[PDB]
Ligand binder design. Structure first.
Ligand SMILES: Cc1cc2nc3c(=O)[nH]c(=O)nc-3n(C[C@H](O)[C@H](O)[C@H](O)COP(=O)(O)OP(=O)(O)OC[C@H]3O[C@@H](n4cnc5c(N)ncnc54)[C@H](O)[C@@H]3O)c2cc1C
Ligand SMILES: Cc1cc2nc3c(=O)[nH]c(=O)nc-3n(C[C@H](O)[C@H](O)[C@H](O)COP(=O)(O)OP(=O)(O)OC[C@H]3O[C@@H](n4cnc5c(N)ncnc54)[C@H](O)[C@@H]3O)c2cc1C
Ligand SMILES: Cc1cc2nc3c(=O)[nH]c(=O)nc-3n(C[C@H](O)[C@H](O)[C@H](O)COP(=O)(O)OP(=O)(O)OC[C@H]3O[C@@H](n4cnc5c(N)ncnc54)[C@H](O)[C@@H]3O)c2cc1C
Ligand SMILES: CCCCCCCC/C=C/CCCCCCCC(=O)O[C@H](COC(=O)CCCCCCCCCCCCCCC)COP(=O)([O-])OCC[N+](C)(C)C
Ligand SMILES: CCCCCCCC/C=C\CCCCCCCC(=O)O[C@H](COC(=O)CCCCCCCCCCCCCCC)COP(=O)([O-])OCC[N+](C)(C)C
Ligand SMILES: CCCCCCCC/C=C\CCCCCCCC(=O)O[C@H](COC(=O)CCCCCCCCCCCCCCC)COP(=O)([O-])OCC[N+](C)(C)C
Ligand code: HEM
Ligand code: HEM
Ligand code: HEM
Lengths: 120, 240, 105, 237, 237
């Protein structure tokens, strides 16, 4: 049983920075990609980034290139996202997501419970 | 009238080729059709042909150096007849034919991944691996074997190419007797040894296999290296 | 990037008829994925490769299309299929999501 | 200087330039103009490899063309003689280009564009749930023309080896004539059969004409076929 | 005996062995010391294919290095200069031999089992992540640009080595001989240098190439030829 657990809700102020964690349990954390996605109220889902734990290979979105970063800790099996220069439009819910395939069964997709970040 | 000295070497090689062809066709095409009917008729143009050239090349290479081994023994342990003289005179043609067939074999071997059958087999293998939830297909000893015999074969072909280049009459009539003898003898023995080791390494663990005897017949690599081993053993014995 | 557009804004549809959703693209895309989301929960994978049902998904849902014209069909509307539906493509590097299609009574 | 190496080089340059322009127009400009696709990476290898085989086979056919004409008129003007004194250069250039074409052709499965296509094909086959991807006639074609091309190249290599000045002085007239005529004709026949077999079923295909122009392999085998047909007619009237 | 081959061959040893222990220090011992990994199967082919190209290109530069010194000292002879200038034929023959060996080694990469296993692993990994397109743009251009240049350089070297047969070399008027021996050799050296330069696409600015404090081998390989070409360009213009 594969599962992903994230941190709790966060409240901040403009000009600060935010850190969110996603811990994956149930498989080998240093083999499969982890995607970071964002959803804002009254807006479409937004694909932020992708990371490969256990090696240096990280893919960014063009808009977010220069503000957000991804780090990985294999010993604790955790992936961290750090976002800087928070504005009034950065309040949203963040998910950590993973794909997988099983022979003769098909594809499966697993999401985190979501971390809510608000600014005021 | 045309090429009087090339008649015998061509008459001997062709027969060998025939004696190989009907052999291979009997082990990889007729047998799978007789039991568990499967038509492997697409292997004739390349796969079957590539099992004939190296055998001819190595047999001619061994026949080049057999007469000297015979002559040394007959001199030591108790003039020469006509057949011995002809064998001593046909060595250059035997070696040139061996080099030609070795180059042909190398050119044939270098073009395996080009064909569509390899692509289809790779796609099927990938699909089968995906459908069985298998992560790693790595095997170590097979990779080691591949690298080793590929390198040995390339080095042997290079040595044969050098010893064939040194045979041009204008180039030949520019060296003293000692250098010509050294080049013709030592490099040739080294090339024969390298080819024998390459053929031996190619067969990794099929020596102990029982499936290799298709009906009662030994595989090809057992017959391919029977004479070079004898020649090298006799050369080593006379060396000591 | 590739922009995905869903034609119907909302479906005030009777509880028991059939529903048809469309996810038009703007560039050549091979396969399309369909997700559904209910309030208070993360999106749930529904259909992958436009013709394959996820494990445990009933047979009411179906998908079809090619080129850039993808359609999700619901045969019978039981009182459980009132949620938001999204479409996603995974060809271009920026994996763009749809805008959603609320379905109501 | 090389006073005897001017006309063959001029002919080879003209043929190469014309073939390069034709292939570039057919394989690059047309997909760009309609249904815009870049396809600009094919020039270094995939376009160059469509010029060398045509230059190699066109110069080989020009070696034996003067011999056919001489027999026809007999049954010499200035042009015929100046043509007959360039056959050795034509053959040497043809051998050089044939070796180059073989060496470029041998290095197709090494590039990355093949690996990416293989990975995409594997992913697509997995997605479509297709278990068997075997096709027979394509395999047969591939094996046959690859083997024929290798044999033809070997015969050309032997014929060119026979041309060393210090080697040609140890051969009498009969052996030299035999080697230079029979083996060369056999090599030309093998090359044209290779080219014919390469085009399996594209002879009855409509989309091979980009606008109205026939494909390269149709033009490439016009002169050798005529030469071989006339040799056959002159052998058995 | 071969009295005239004594000096170059020794040099070919020192360039070779010193390269080997260098490569083994960066591809085998370093991964073993940190992040323990065997990587012991690269010696038979992968390590050897990094020694042949360097010896081939280093001996080619030594042929034309006395040429630039002779012109300079004349504007501004010892026994060592004559000893250097009497071994250019041997240096060129050795360079051609090693270039042929390097080309043959490079042409045999896709036929090994390691490539097949890597391809299968790549296909499995790509299927397990739902990525439809693995195509990339700049790598295809990168690897399709320099292969043709290397092949052309090898062809030029082969032609210039064929020109060196003693029977062939007495049929020239020394002007054609000088032209072939100088201009074609310079063009071949330039083509090889450009091929090596294009091989390293963006590793020049990468920092992971320096394992501990050592620069990569492609920086060392193209040091002397660049100086030789710069001096030749200065002298010509
Ligand atoms: C590719 C190739 C090219 C060759 N080209 C030539 C050639 O141009 N000319 C030529 O003469 N031979 C040529 N040979 C044959 C060559 O002479 C033999 O390989 C070699 O000289 C025989 O070695 P040996 O030890 O038996 O000679 P030897 O030592 O002379 O023979 C051993 C005994 O025979 C006799 C004495 O009793 C002596 O003790 C060629 C061989 C090859 C493989
Ligand atoms: C690779 C190659 C090398 C060649 N080398 C030579 C050569 O060294 N000398 C030469 O005269 N021709 C050479 N030729 C040309 C050809 O071998 C001869 O012209 C030969 O006579 C074939 O022409 P033919 O059958 O019309 O001759 P014929 O009509 O039989 O002879 C009439 C004179 C070469 C051709 C090729 C393809
Ligand atoms: C493959 C190869 C073969 C060569 N063969 C010869 C040869 O047979 N004879 C020779 O003198 N040089 C030979 N050279 C060396 C080369 O031809 C000389 O550098 C040339 O003769 C003069 O070059 P240069 O620029 O120093 O001319 P300058 O002497 O400076 O005018 C060979 C070089 C190569 C790469
Ligand atoms: C298989 C891998 C290995 C291949 C080997 C290739 C290497 C081939 C050989 C390379 C040179 C090796 C020289 C060995 C020295 C012995 C010979 C000798 O002494 O005479 C030599 C002359 O003779 C020559 O040098 C002529 C060179 C012939 C080369 C053939 C070109 C065909 C192109 C093949 C196309 C390849 C396509 C490949 C595509 C993939 C020296 O001269 P000399 O007579 O002693 O008298 C001069 C006196 N002094 C000045 C010396 C005092
Ligand atoms: C893999 C890439 C690398 C490859 C490197 C290749 C480069 C190889 C380099 C050079 C090529 C080797 C040239 C050797 C010269 C021939 C010796 C000679 O003089 O013969 C003469 C006759 O001449 C003949 O009979 C014709 C020669 C037939 C020999 C075939 C050998 C293979 C030829 C092609 C090799 C490649 C095949 C290519 C196949 C695709 C001797 O006749 P004789 O009178 O009986 O003997 C006495 C002679 N005298 C003293 C009286 C004068
Ligand atoms: C993969 C398979 C490999 C198989 C290899 C097979 C190897 C083949 C084995 C050996 C090749 C031997 C070729 C010998 C032919 C030269 C004969 C001669 O003396 O003519 C000379 C030409 O003068 C020249 O120097 C021109 C150069 C000719 C070279 C063109 C063909 C070489 C092929 C290159 C290989 C391509 C390598 C590409 C590598 C990327 C004389 O000058 P002429 O005035 O013009 O003639 C009349 C003068 N006389 C004689 C009457 C007095
Ligand atoms: C570049 C040079 C060479 C390459 C790339 C090469 C490669 C190969 C390959 C791929 C095979 C496997 C054949 C098969 O699976 O059907 C093989 C087998 C063999 N090779 Fe080589 N080889 C080279 C040179 C040589 C030389 C110079 C000789 C002998 C003088 C030789 C003798 C043999 C023999 C006897 C076999 C086994 C034949 C059999 O099992 O029936 N090879 N080589
Ligand atoms: C080892 C030797 C050879 C090999 C491996 C070989 C391989 C090939 C390949 C792979 C093609 C396909 C070209 C493409 O797809 O664009 C081809 C086509 C062709 N080959 Fe060769 N070949 C060899 C020798 C020769 C020789 C000796 C000749 C002529 C004397 C020749 C003439 C041709 C011609 C005319 C074509 C048609 C190409 C076109 O029309 O686009 N080949 N060969
Ligand atoms: C058909 C002919 C040739 C082919 C197919 C070829 C191919 C290659 C390949 C595949 C590499 C990559 C090596 C690696 O990744 O380890 C390479 C590198 C290289 N090549 Fe060649 N090559 C050819 C001829 C030549 C020639 C004629 C020269 C020089 C005169 C040359 C000099 C080099 C050098 C210096 C490198 C750099 C390798 C390193 O520094 O690690 N090559 N070539």
């Amino acid at each position: 049983q594969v599962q992903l657990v994230q941190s709790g809700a966060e409240v901040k102020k403009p000009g600060a920075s935010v850190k969110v964690s996603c811990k994956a349990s149930g498989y080998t954390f240093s083999t499969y990609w982890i995607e970071w996605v964002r959803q804002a109220p009254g807006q479409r889902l937004e694909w932020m980034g992708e990371i490969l734990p256990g090696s240096g290979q990280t893919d960014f979105n063009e808009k977010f290139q220069g503000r957000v970063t991804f780090t990985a800790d294999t010993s604790s099996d955790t992936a961290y996202m750090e976002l800087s220069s928070l504005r009034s439009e950065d309040t949203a819910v963040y998910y950590c997501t993973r794909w997988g395939y099983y022979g003769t069964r098909g594809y499966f997709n697993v999401w985190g419970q979501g971390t809510l970040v608000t600014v005021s | 009238e045309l090429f009087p000295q090339w008649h015998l070497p061509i008459k001997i090689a062709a027969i060998i080729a025939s004696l190989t062809f009907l052999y291979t066709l009997l082990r990889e095409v007729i047998h799978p059709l007789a039991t568990s009917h499967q038509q492997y008729f697409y292997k004739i143009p390349i796969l079957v042909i590539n099992k004939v050239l190296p055998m001819v090349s190595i047999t001619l290479l061994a026949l080049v150096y057999l007469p000297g081994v015979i002559a040394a023994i007959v001199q030591l342990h108790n003039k020469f007849p006509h057949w011995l003289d002809k064998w001593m005179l046909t060595r250059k043609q035997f070696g040139l034919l061996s080099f030609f067939f070795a180059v042909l074999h190398a050119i044939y071997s270098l073009s395996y991944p080009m064909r569509r059958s390899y692509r289809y087999k790779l796609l099927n293998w990938a699909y089968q691996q995906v459908q069985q939830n298998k992560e790693d297909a790595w095997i170590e000893h097979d990779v080691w074997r591949m690298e080793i015999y590929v390198s040995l074969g390339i080095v042997g072909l290079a040595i044969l190419a050098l010893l064939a280049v040194t045979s041009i009459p204008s180039v030949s009539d520019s060296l003293t007797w000692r250098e010509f003898h050294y080049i013709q003898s030592k490099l040739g023995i080294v090339s024969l040894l390298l080819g024998t080791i390459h053929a031996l390494i190619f067969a990794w663990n099929k020596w102990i296999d029982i499936k290799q005897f298709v009906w009662y017949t030994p595989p090809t690599f057992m017959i391919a290296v029977f004479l070079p081993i004898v020649v090298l053993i006799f050369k080593s014995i006379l060396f000591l | 990037e590739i922009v995905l557009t869903q034609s119907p804004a909302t479906l005030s549809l009777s509880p028991g008829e059939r529903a048809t959703l469309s996810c038009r693209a703007s560039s050549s895309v091979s396969y399309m994925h369909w997700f559904q989301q209910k309030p208070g929960q993360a999106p749930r994978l529904l259909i992958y490769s436009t013709s394959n049902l996820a494990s445990g998904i009933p047979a009411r849902f179906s998908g079809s299309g090619s080129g850039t014209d993808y359609t999700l069909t619901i045969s019978s509307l039981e009182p459980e299929d009132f949620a938001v539906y999204y479409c996603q493509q995974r060809r271009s590097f920026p994996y763009t999501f749809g805008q959603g299609t609320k379905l109501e009574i």
